[PDB]
Amino acid sequence: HDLPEGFEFMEHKVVNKDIHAPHENLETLRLTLTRQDEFLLREEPVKCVTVTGTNGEYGIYPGHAYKIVQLNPSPLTVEYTDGTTKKYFVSGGFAHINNEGSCDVNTVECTLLDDLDLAIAEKELAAQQAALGSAKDDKAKSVVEIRISVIEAVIAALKHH
């Protein structure tokens, strides 16, 4: 009695390029932006994608080397070959960049920057800062500071444009 593995029912696998192969000139990056097991974009050809990982900001274009990036609460930008920019905001996750010309950005939450409200974000920062002052212990303060970092990133993200 053998059971199928849950990945057998998924027909869109990841294509890796053999190390002993010729190079190709690619003008499109196939992006897959995903939230909570839901793709907002699927194998979408784009011009470039900008992501904010722990070390810093990465601008991924077609042909980017194989890399894994641990994202941080921050905006994410997608620029199409047409010349159109679409901006999301993510709270965390990972970004896998493949040398074959694909980028799978899986996030816990990915919301268009339009949906976010600066007035709500601003007043939340004031409340959390007050909460940090009343934070009982070290752990509580650390949790509160996590919220503030995200809030300030959201506030700064919207103030940018």
Binding site: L3, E5, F9, Y66, N98, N99
Partner: protein, 51 residues
């Protein structure tokens, strides 16, 4: 724990619901396999990922 298994139901279609499995090896065994894939031709499709 040597492994953590998840046994669930996959909805193939409105009338087809199969039984599916996700096996998750603990950190020690996973990093050991991840180490062999990087160092060897075996697990080719995982060679670039492992490194």
């Amino acid at each position: 724990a040597d492994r953590y298994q998840v046994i669930f139901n996959r909805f193939v279609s409105a009338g087809v619901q199969r039984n599916a499995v996700y096996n998750i090896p603990s950190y020690e065994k996973w990093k050991e396999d991840l180490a062999d894939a990087a160092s060897s031709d075996n697990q080719k499709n995982r060679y670039l990922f492992a490194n």
